[PDB]
């Protein structure tokens, strides 16, 4: 209730459309602002993509140490890791790490190819119970973020529930689960979004995303000391303020989420 008004005030000053979901795993209870509205995912999809790959590894259809070869012509804009390994190539695990930790666009496209494309990612999501999130396009076309376009979107609540089952539930094997946590925890943003609003003593594994039509997102599983973990998803789009302002918007969601856990009662 109170956090809602605070977020709606924050949404006004952003000029855009803000969506937040908070899933407390101690109770399975969730708080949500536009939690059942569609928002463009941009790079936050890469957390799901590495999950779907690890699920192939669990099934035996993939190996984290499989070498993937690619040439200069497979590269798209923003490939900080993969661009320096056109010769060697990279293992699946190295592409997953590059995609989560640095948002390497070629890594994600290479992992989508190994998977079977946006439809295979969407198909995996369905198999774990997410009936909402959808990936339709490849990098970088999927960062369009056009209002009313349902392609490449999720909801704050759907994304939060999906992170819960992948990182904390029984969707992946325990080892794949631990591996996906390890990748998300070693973000190198790093960091100015949710991370910036939170207590430093927290262990945070997060994924950021940026797009057109004034879009910045951040999703995260947070482990507070001596406390069950909490899943926070934040989606901002149609924002009229600039990229640095959008970062501070997301950090302010983080601060408000903490205040409401400690004080609203
Ligand atoms: O992100 N959080 O929802 C959250 C809530 C309460 C907390 N106490 N410590 N860290 C926290 C994070």
Numbering used by the authors: 27 to 58, 60 to 238, 240 to 252, 254 to 294
Structure paper excerpt:
Specifically, X-ray crystallography in the presence of 5(6)-nitrobenzotriazole, a known transition-state analogue of the Kemp elimination reaction and inhibition by this analogue support that Kemp elimination does occur at the site generated by the W229D replacement. Following from this, 3D-structure determination in the presence of the transition-state analogue confirms the role of conformational flexibility in the generation of a new function, as transition-state binding is shown to rely on conformational rearrangements. Specifically, the bound transition-state analogue is displaced with respect to the position originally occupied by the tryptophan 229, as required by the presence of an aspartate residue at position 229 in the active variants. Such a displacement is made possible by a shift of the h11 α-helix (and the concomitant shift of the substantially solvent-exposed h1 α-helix). We note also that the catalytic efficiency for the Kemp elimination in the engineered ancestral proteins correlates with the transition-state analogue binding constants derived from inhibition experiments, supporting that catalysis is linked to transition-state stabilization. We subsequently performed MD simulations in the presence of the transition-state analogue 5(6)-nitrobenzotriazole (TSA) to explore the impact of transition-state binding on the conformational dynamics, as well as how well each system could accommodate the transition state in its new active site. The W229D variants of the ancestral scaffolds that give rise to substantial Kemp elimination activity (PNCA, GNCAMP and GNCA4) can accept the TSA in the MD simulations, although the TSA dissociates from the less active W229D variant of the PNCA scaffold after about 50 ns.
Here, we explore and test these notions using resurrected Precambrian β-lactamases11 as scaffolds for the engineering of completely new active sites. Of these systems, resurrected Precambrian β-lactamases have been thoroughly characterized in terms of their structure, function and stability. These putative ancestral proteins have been shown to be highly stable and able to efficiently degrade several antibiotics. A hydrophobic-to-ionizable amino acid replacement generates a buried (or partially buried) residue with the perturbed properties that are useful in catalysis and conformational flexibility assists the generation of a completely new active site by facilitating substrate and transition-state binding. We have shown that, when using resurrected Precambrian β-lactamases as scaffolds for protein engineering, a minimalist design approach based on this mechanism leads to levels of catalysis for the Kemp elimination reaction of up to approximately seven orders of magnitude above the rate of the uncatalysed reaction, as well as to significant ester hydrolysis activity.
